[PDB]
Amino acid sequence: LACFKLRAFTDNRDDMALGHVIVLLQQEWPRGENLFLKAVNKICQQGNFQYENFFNYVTNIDMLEEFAYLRTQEGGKIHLELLPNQGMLIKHHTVTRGITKGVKEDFRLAMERQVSRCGENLMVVLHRFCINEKILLLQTLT
Amino acid sequence: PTVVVMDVSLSMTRPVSIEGSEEYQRKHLAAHGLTMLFEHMATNYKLEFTALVVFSSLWELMVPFTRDYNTLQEALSNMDDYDKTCLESALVGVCNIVQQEWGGAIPCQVVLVTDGCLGIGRGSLRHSLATQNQRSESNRFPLPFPFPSKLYIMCMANLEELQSTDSLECLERLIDLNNGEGQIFTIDGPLCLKNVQSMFGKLIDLAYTPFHAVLKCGHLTADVQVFPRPEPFVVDEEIDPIPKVINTDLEIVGFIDI
């Protein structure tokens, strides 16, 4: 969580860092809402956010709630990508009707799925997201 | 009439703490159960129409004057999301749509329906909605609307979460600016739809009691029986006023020009 906060709060606007910072706010919330607020406000209208490991890795309500609130007029009133593998799909998920209002519906559907999949606890979701990151960043530890 | 505020908001498209009520989306929870927006009219206020509209920023209303709670359930289930989030504005729009659809002069009862979890800063919805302490040139604003209704923002969660999100604080400030539009947020913990139903259950103010009574008028062939309780008025306070009951009897005495 400290590493995610360092990567997100810095001058960079990494989609992985923002998703991790929002997801790492599942450990401390609503007491530790500062990290979630910074992740939500920083990536409210990011646009160029190459992310493909946020839909399944994040299972807490807050992570999807930040994106859902950003989709409204209280989070910049802009379009965003919320489909699975959105970073790679951006070539085929360009600006359309589904990226502003349909994106909000997709975020609602993802939140509904997380509610249905609420059996995955904070520890289980954290372990699964760490495993997915380790698979992705196995040769990118540097 | 009836007023229903279906929170079709992008902010109101996520769970409260961990998961939704009926283990699914807000639409599933709405289908499973609802607030007192329709139960009171179904039980007591029978002569009332409802405008099933799901809207945040614009009057996306398709339901005309009708008492069908199925349409309200479908609209609430259809309140997926939108491009706005503002509780007071949603309440104002719901009241306006209900007045324009169910009846202009028919009273209704609207409430605030939004998530409000935007965060204090550049996107706070209370700043752009609670605007009443200035603008003397435009004092004749939409607030208060031309209909008796107390917009209430629901609150059933922890005190720390309610204070951090500034839900209860903004609701109380809006109530104070609107002079009582909203009950005291005396609720905490994992509470079901009881505080919301209590705050939205004030739409049954025009009920009636289908009872009967009798009277005795001696041994005449033309008697009389008292009617139900009348409407109280300022005539004689005496010790204290109270609602009337079934009167014992009257007496037919006197004869004057018709």
From Swiss-Prot, chain A:
Signal peptide: none annotated. It is found in: Nucleus. Component of the integrator complex, a multiprotein complex that terminates RNA polymerase II (Pol II) transcription in the promoter-proximal region of genes. Belongs to the Integrator subunit 10 family. Component of the Integrator complex, composed of core subunits INTS1, INTS2, INTS3, INTS4, INTS5, INTS6, INTS7, INTS8, INTS9/RC74, INTS10, INTS11/CPSF3L, INTS12, INTS13, INTS14 and INTS15. The core complex associates with protein phosphatase 2A subunits PPP2CA and PPP2R1A, to form the Integrator-PP2A (INTAC) complex. INTS10 is part of the tail subcomplex, composed of INTS10, INTS13, INTS14 and INTS15. This is Integrator complex subunit 10. It comes from Homo sapiens (Human). The lineage of its organism: Eukaryota, Metazoa, Chordata, Craniata, Vertebrata. The chain holds residues 569 to 710 of 710 of the full protein.
Curated annotation (Swiss-Prot), chain B:
It is found in: Nucleus. It comes from the Eukaryota. This is Integrator complex subunit 14. Residues 1-203 form the VWFA domain. Component of the integrator complex, a multiprotein complex that terminates RNA polymerase II (Pol II) transcription in the promoter-proximal region of genes. The chain holds residues 2 to 259 of 518 of the full protein. Component of the Integrator complex, composed of core subunits INTS1, INTS2, INTS3, INTS4, INTS5, INTS6, INTS7, INTS8, INTS9/RC74, INTS10, INTS11/CPSF3L, INTS12, INTS13, INTS14 and INTS15. The core complex associates with protein phosphatase 2A subunits PPP2CA and PPP2R1A, to form the Integrator-PP2A (INTAC) complex. INTS14 is part of the tail subcomplex, composed of INTS10, INTS13, INTS14 and INTS15. Mg(2+) binds at residues 9, 11, 85. Belongs to the Integrator subunit 14 family. Strongly expressed in numerous cancer cells compared with their non-cancerous counterparts (lung, prostate, colon, stomach and skin).
